[PDB]
Design an enzyme around this catalytic site. Structure first.
Site, PDB file in Angstrom:
ATOM      1  N   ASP A   1       0.846  -1.198   0.000  1.00 13.43           N
ATOM      2  CA  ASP A   1       0.000   0.000   0.000  1.00 13.43           C
ATOM      3  C   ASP A   1       0.883   1.251   0.000  1.00 13.43           C
ATOM      4  O   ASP A   1       1.861   1.353   0.759  1.00 13.43           O
ATOM      5  CB  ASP A   1      -0.947   0.030   1.199  1.00 13.43           C
ATOM      6  CG  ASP A   1      -1.957  -1.068   1.179  1.00 13.43           C
ATOM      7  OD1 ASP A   1      -2.046  -1.777   0.156  1.00 13.43           O
ATOM      8  OD2 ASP A   1      -2.621  -1.294   2.243  1.00 13.43           O
TER       9      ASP A   1
ATOM     10  N   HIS B   1      -7.688   8.788   1.169  1.00 11.24           N
ATOM     11  CA  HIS B   1      -7.513   7.807   2.239  1.00 11.24           C
ATOM     12  C   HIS B   1      -8.418   8.032   3.453  1.00 11.24           C
ATOM     13  O   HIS B   1      -7.988   7.847   4.591  1.00 11.24           O
ATOM     14  CB  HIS B   1      -6.028   7.815   2.668  1.00 11.24           C
ATOM     15  CG  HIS B   1      -5.538   6.555   3.330  1.00 11.24           C
ATOM     16  ND1 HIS B   1      -5.310   6.472   4.690  1.00 11.24           N
ATOM     17  CD2 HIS B   1      -5.133   5.374   2.813  1.00 11.24           C
ATOM     18  CE1 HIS B   1      -4.834   5.268   4.984  1.00 11.24           C
ATOM     19  NE2 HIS B   1      -4.696   4.586   3.855  1.00 11.24           N
TER      20      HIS B   1
ATOM     21  N   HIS C   1       5.971  -3.874   3.212  1.00 11.60           N
ATOM     22  CA  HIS C   1       6.251  -2.447   3.373  1.00 11.60           C
ATOM     23  C   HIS C   1       7.593  -1.996   2.818  1.00 11.60           C
ATOM     24  O   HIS C   1       8.474  -2.815   2.554  1.00 11.60           O
ATOM     25  CB  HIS C   1       6.133  -2.070   4.874  1.00 11.60           C
ATOM     26  CG  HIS C   1       4.764  -2.284   5.435  1.00 11.60           C
ATOM     27  ND1 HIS C   1       4.339  -3.485   5.952  1.00 11.60           N
ATOM     28  CD2 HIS C   1       3.708  -1.447   5.512  1.00 11.60           C
ATOM     29  CE1 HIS C   1       3.076  -3.374   6.334  1.00 11.60           C
ATOM     30  NE2 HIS C   1       2.674  -2.145   6.065  1.00 11.60           N
TER      31      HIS C   1
HETATM   32  C1  LIG Z   1      -4.351  -1.377   5.356  1.00  6.87           C
HETATM   33 AS1  LIG Z   1      -3.307   0.266   5.297  1.00  6.87          AS
HETATM   34  C2  LIG Z   1      -2.644   0.723   7.091  1.00  6.87           C
HETATM   35  O1  LIG Z   1      -2.049   0.034   4.175  1.00  6.87           O
HETATM   36  O2  LIG Z   1      -4.333   1.538   4.753  1.00  6.87           O
HETATM   37 ZN   LIG Z   2      -3.623   2.838   3.582  1.00  6.67          ZN
HETATM   38 ZN   LIG Z   3       0.893  -1.256   6.452  1.00  5.50          ZN
END
Ligand SMILES: C[As](C)(=O)[O-]
Ligand SMILES: [Zn+2]
Ligand SMILES: [Zn+2]
Ligand SMILES: [Zn+2]
Ligand SMILES: [Zn+2]
Length: 207
Positions: free
Chosen positions: A42, A97, A173
């Site tokens: 993400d 978001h 990540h």
């Molecule tokens: C599920 As997320 C913390 O990448 O918006």
């Molecule tokens: Zn996110």
């Molecule tokens: Zn995350």
């Protein structure tokens, strides 16, 4: 039939969540009888290591989906173009978001459509099929509205942020200097255990 608006936070997944996803175009796992797995990221913030992640994925020939926000698209056009140019899928993580359960229907449609149109115009990706909700927050309503707009609701089965099974969808990540190294090691290690890294397009075809 009034859709339920009660919010849930994704975590793993239980009967309630399982059937909410099943009936409303959602998934969190691929086929559990095959050793295919699915890497995703993400991208609502750029910590400065996404280029290093992309370098690893290119070296290892591993596909991923990057779920991007509008802030990310506007501020990181060059990384976005690497994603498309190097064989990845760009997913939709909404314009600003917000928690999807906290916005009205008109706003949710704008939050998704704006990113989809921006991905297509900026990168030339043909289709934007995959949505991951901000913070994994959802209701029956938001799942159903997202599907109605023509998207899959894509959650995950394993997330790792430093504070595996068949069909796993990983959420990894790009936060620190060492993450790129960890990713390279994880890819190597999982391939030695017979796993194959596939795309979300492959998942859908895996049926
Ligand atoms: C599920 As997320 C913390 O990448 O918006
Ligand atoms: Zn996110
Ligand atoms: Zn995350
Ligand atoms: Zn396979
Ligand atoms: Zn911004």
């Amino acid at each position: 039939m009034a859709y339920t608006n009660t919010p849930h936070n994704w975590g793993i997944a239980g009967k309630l969540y399982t059937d909410l996803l099943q009936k409303n175009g959602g998934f969190y796992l691929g086929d559990t009888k095959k050793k295919d797995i699915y890497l995703t990221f993400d991208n609502g913030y750029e910590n400065g290591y996404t280029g290093k992640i992309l370098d690893v994925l290119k070296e290892k020939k591993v596909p991923a989906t990057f779920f991007v926000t509008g802030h990310y698209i506007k501020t990181q056009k060059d990384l976005l173009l690497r994603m498309k140019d190097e064989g990845h899928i760009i997913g939709n993580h909404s314009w600003s978001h917000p928690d999807f359960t906290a916005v009205n229907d008109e706003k949710l449609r704008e939050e998704l459509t704006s990113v989809t149109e921006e991905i297509k115009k900026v990168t030339g990706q043909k289709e934007v099929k995959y949505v991951r909700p901000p913070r994994g927050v959802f209701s029956e309503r938001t799942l159903a509205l997202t599907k109605e707009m023509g998207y899959y609701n894509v959650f995950w089965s394993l997330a790792f942020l430093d504070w595996i099974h068949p069909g796993s969808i990983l959420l990894l990540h790009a936060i620190s200097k060492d993450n790129a190294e960890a990713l390279a090691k994880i890819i190597d290690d999982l391939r030695e255990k017979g796993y194959h890294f596939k795309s979300l397009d492959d998942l859908v075809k895996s049926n």
